[PDB]
Design a binder for these strands. Structure first.
Lengths: 122, 155, 88, 132, 50
RNA sequence: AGGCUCGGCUGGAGCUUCCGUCAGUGCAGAUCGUAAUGGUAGUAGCAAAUAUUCAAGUUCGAUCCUUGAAGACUGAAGUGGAGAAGGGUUCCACGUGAACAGUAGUUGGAUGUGGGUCAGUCGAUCCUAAGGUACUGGCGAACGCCUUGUAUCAUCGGUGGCG
RNA sequence: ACGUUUCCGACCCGUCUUGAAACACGGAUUGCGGAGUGCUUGUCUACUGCGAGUCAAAGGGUGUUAAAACCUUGCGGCGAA
RNA sequence: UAAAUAUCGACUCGAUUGCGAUAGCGAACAAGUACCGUGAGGGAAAGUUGCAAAGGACUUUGAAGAGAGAGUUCAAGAGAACGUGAAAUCGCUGGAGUGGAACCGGAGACAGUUGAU
RNA sequence: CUCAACCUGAACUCAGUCGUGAUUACCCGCUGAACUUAAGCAUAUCAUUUAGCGGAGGAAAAGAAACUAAAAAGGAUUCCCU
RNA sequence: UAGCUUCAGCGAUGGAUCGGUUGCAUCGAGUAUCGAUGAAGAACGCAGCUUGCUGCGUUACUUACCACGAAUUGCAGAGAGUGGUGAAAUUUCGAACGCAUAGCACCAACUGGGCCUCCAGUUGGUACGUCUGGUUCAGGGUUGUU
């Protein structure tokens, strides 16, 4: 019946592949039943099997992506699919440190000129 | 076909004016928005005056108006020197500096010098670091009566 | 003779289906779509065709990615994080 | 009169929200009052009705009939009560839909989550009634 | 034409699938208003201007 | 007078006096817009392409569907047998009540449900024709255009040895 | 009283036109829709307030039955040559 | 080189002396849809049973449509194209007129209607 | 003639970047009519406007005087009233 | 008599009018977020039964996670299902990218065909313009050196 991704998370790659193959075989059997005048109870399991295949693939892909993200966490150049997907304009924006950069003249002006806190008596 | 005694028509409506129409249904909305902007600015820069920099006194240019004075853009460097205020210091303590205006008459220079003097008298300067005051900074109980000023500074 | 007799000879299509817009407006001999301008890089729109612009503008399709971006903007385009690990 | 500038007193907007509410909102909409005794016993005034609750019809042609909530047809905004049925022409029996606002709950189907919900509602009622 | 293209065959297949009577159980759904398929096409009356 | 009040019948959820004020405020016409309906009228008409008849079957029901017998026609530059463009399931089987088949219908290119298109050798795929369209190069405020040419032009690839 | 019957009168409406019942045009019938409006600028008239003044603009201040109402103008419009 | 400024095209909201299905956006609905044109493009009509389908079991004539009974229902003359249900047009029953128009105004009569402390 | 510089110009599926194409209400640069009014019409008007092309943002553009002016002078840009 | 006209009563045809209204119009407010990490748009496909509309993309009327807490509903059927949404995934055309534009072709690796020069499969890659740097170069263009 309905698998639990909580439980599947602990399994290993080979185990997940095996379970995916079992689910696919069961789906093929149910598809045969569909054409060969299958019972309504039998046909009602197709949706569950399909969503179970979806769950297994979800877990597999999530674990693979986590491993790859960890692997490339420190490389200067990362694969395109492992980079931040903000908007294109946001990606073209300057970095925070580049924005914070100030020239020597601006630093000197910051040192010398600094607004004070004051009030005016009415 | 005008008939009888009439004033000759003058209405400038021969262009496709229906493509350029401006209504004023958002006048109260704009009023509210500007009040809210002033409130936000006051919260941001408290206790400094909401109006902002202090402006100078100015004679209206032409002889039709020269008997009236009004707020100018800022204080000329001659006036700042006469009041003994550096331009750099004025920018910090919130006084507008008009780098284009120059004084050619003692009375005009003196009016603005006096204005600067009274502003300095009314000024309250907070210590740069609250823990440690310095020379020039206002006194402790003076810093308690500090309140945000609304409207023009020295109207 | 112009009319019934002449219409019997109409059996060669001037336009076929366009790859970009799917309309039957791709001129075979001119090799250009009379509707979207394919294969020009840019799209064919004219301000005198207001109804045509309305028919083929944004929002008349699925706007899948635009809706996705709108959904993700509401939370500041946060990435790399997950909800607080909890349970039922 | 409402004061919240983000709450709409538009009849059309209210009707649209009511008739297009999703299932979790229809749950809240389909709430029923507790009887007097149940109200004093549990501390709450009303709760979102649930299947396997016991109710008594308070108004309509079936006023006074009791039973158990067989189903909560959230799509139709009605509940089907046990023993509240009519007969079609052929002879089959069909449950008569009743709006939950016209019945009163006489026994709450309590579980972990329903108990927690009742505890929250009772705590809030006590808190507000103390201030009032 | 007998000698056709795969894309044309694909479009014709979709049109064939769409030309179908409405399922009978749809009339029993809650709030349903459709009584039949109003987009049926007859090969001789209306032509797919492909 | 514009119109108004009441009664009776139908109907099932709103309506109203008076005071101010406002208006998308009154129809017989505009070869007015739109929707519906008359007399004409059971009328004009359903007349090109020679032609049908007998017995039976099925059916509630047969000029028209099916079988057999007869009589005719196209008459091989066919009313025969197959294809290209075009159509797109109209192909085939089994049901069919309504609509459609300008009479009818048990029949149908109609309608409901299913089935059906099998390639190393048939085509596409491959070559180029008329011609189209790129490159650069020029022009152009610009989208982009013009030339397919020594205009442009540093446009490679073949044998052999070595490896 | 839109029934019948008598006696008297009685040409089909709208329109353009000197002149229409016209052998002038529109009108087979019924329902519903259908045409001097908005705004700017003038001028006169009527009413209201104040009156050598009057109206105040943008704006500002306040207002939560907060697009309203209320307060607010060395200055501006028209008038006073 | 910010602010004051423009703008609802996009996303999210609040309102109204606006329209109330021939109105209001073309579109209240499987509407930029059906459909039309080779193409650029053009472009509709279409809201309403009932509180609840309780959507008419069963008998009966018919091949069937359908009808006669019955049942449900506040009610079905609310019966599916279903709230109301106008005019034009049309059918039946009864009365009355009826010689190449019919209608109409005025004045009676008849029929008829209505009032009488 | 050998080697080595520079200058100029190439080829690379060389390492790593960036542009293209949509949207229309507002914004910036161009190109650019005629109907219409003048009771005709050609300058004029419509209009430095429909239509066409290009380029951005949340605003854009402008912006810190080769300014206004002629006072006892004002003092970047943008916007409102006049 | 019949027909015709007319009146009263009854019934058809037709869909006006009335009664609201999840629609429209206008005004105001708050935000700034498309695309080679492949947009807008198009095509095809996806459900047990589901043509259309809506939703989605081969994990295809949706997966994971988080909140709430018992349904969905036409028939079936069996922490539900709704909402949020940060993880994963996101077909083919399309600026659309190997070349062409509804077709055919090149480079590598790996796998199978028994071996393979030959087949087949899978995976990665091969667009134009441009910047920075790298490598390999060309020119008596200027210069030095032998």
């Amino acid at each position: 019946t309905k698998l639990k991704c909580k439980s599947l998370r602990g399994e290993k790659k080979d185990a997940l592949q095996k379970k995916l193959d079992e689910q696919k075989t069961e789906l093929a059997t149910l598809r045969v039943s569909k054409v060969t005048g299958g019972a309504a109870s039998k046909l009602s399991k197709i949706r569950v099997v399909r969503k179970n295949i979806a769950r297994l693939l979800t877990v597999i892909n999530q674990t693979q992506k986590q491993e790859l993200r960890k692997f490339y966490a420190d490389h200067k150049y990362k694969p395109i699919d492992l980079r931040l997907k903000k908007t294109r304009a946001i990606r073209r924006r300057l970095t925070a440190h580049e924005l914070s950069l100030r020239s020597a003249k601006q630093q000197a002006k910051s040192r010398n000129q600094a607004v004070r806190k004051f009030a005016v008596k009415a | 076909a005008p008939r009888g005694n009439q004033m000759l028509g003058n209405a400038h409506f021969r262009k496709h004016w229906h493509k350029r129409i401006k209504t004023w249904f958002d006048q109260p909305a704009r009023k509210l928005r500007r009040r809210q902007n002033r409130q936000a600015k006051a919260v941001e820069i408290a206790p400094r005056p909401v109006a902002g920099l202090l402006r100078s006194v100015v004679r209206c240019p032409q002889k039709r108006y020269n008997t009236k004075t009004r707020l100018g853009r800022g204080f000329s460097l001659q006036e700042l020197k006469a009041a003994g205020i550096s331009q750099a210091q004025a920018r910090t303590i919130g006084i507008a500096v008009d780098v284009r205006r120059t004084n050619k008459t003692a009375e005009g220079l003196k009016a603005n010098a006096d204005r600067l003097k009274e502003y300095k008298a009314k000024l309250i300067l907070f210590p740069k670091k609250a823990s440690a005051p310095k020379k020039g900074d206002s006194s402790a109980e003076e810093l308690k009566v500090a309140a945000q000023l609304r409207g023009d500074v020295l109207p | 003779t112009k009319g019934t007799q002449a219409f019997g000879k109409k059996h060669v299509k001037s336009h076929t289906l366009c790859k970009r817009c799917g309309k039957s407006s791709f001129h075979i001999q001119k090799k250009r779509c009379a509707s979207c301008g394919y294969p020009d890089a840019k799209k064919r729109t004219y301000n005198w065709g207001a109804k045509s612009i309305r028919r083929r503008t944004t929002g008349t399709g699925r706007t899948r990615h635009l809706r996705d971006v709108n959904a993700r903007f509401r939370n500041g385009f946060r990435e790399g994080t997950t909800p607080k690990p909890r349970a039922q | 009169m409402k004061v919240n500038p983000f709450v709409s007193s538009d009849s059309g907007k209210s009707r649209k929200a009511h008739f297009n509410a999703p299932s979790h909102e229809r749950r809240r909409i389909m709430s029923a009052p507790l009887t007097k005794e149940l109200r004093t016993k549990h501390g709450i005034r009303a709760i979102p009705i649930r299947t396997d609750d016991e109710v008594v019809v308070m108004r309509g042609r079936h006023k006074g009939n009791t039973g158990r909530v067989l189903r909560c047809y959230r799509k139709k905004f009605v509940i089907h009560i046990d023993k509240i049925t009519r007969e079609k022409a052929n002879g089959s029996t069909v449950h008569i839909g009743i709006h939950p606002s016209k019945v009163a709950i006489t026994k709450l189907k309590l579980d972990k989550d329903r108990r927690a919900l009742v505890e929250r509602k009772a705590a809030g009622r006590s808190r507000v009634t103390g201030i009032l | 034409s007998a000698l056709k293209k795969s894309f044309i065959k694909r479009k014709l297949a979709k049109k064939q699938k769409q030309n179908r009577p409405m399922p009978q159980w749809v009339r029993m759904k809650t709030g349903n208003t459709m009584k039949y398929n109003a987009k049926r096409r007859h090969w001789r009356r209306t032509k797919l201007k492909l």
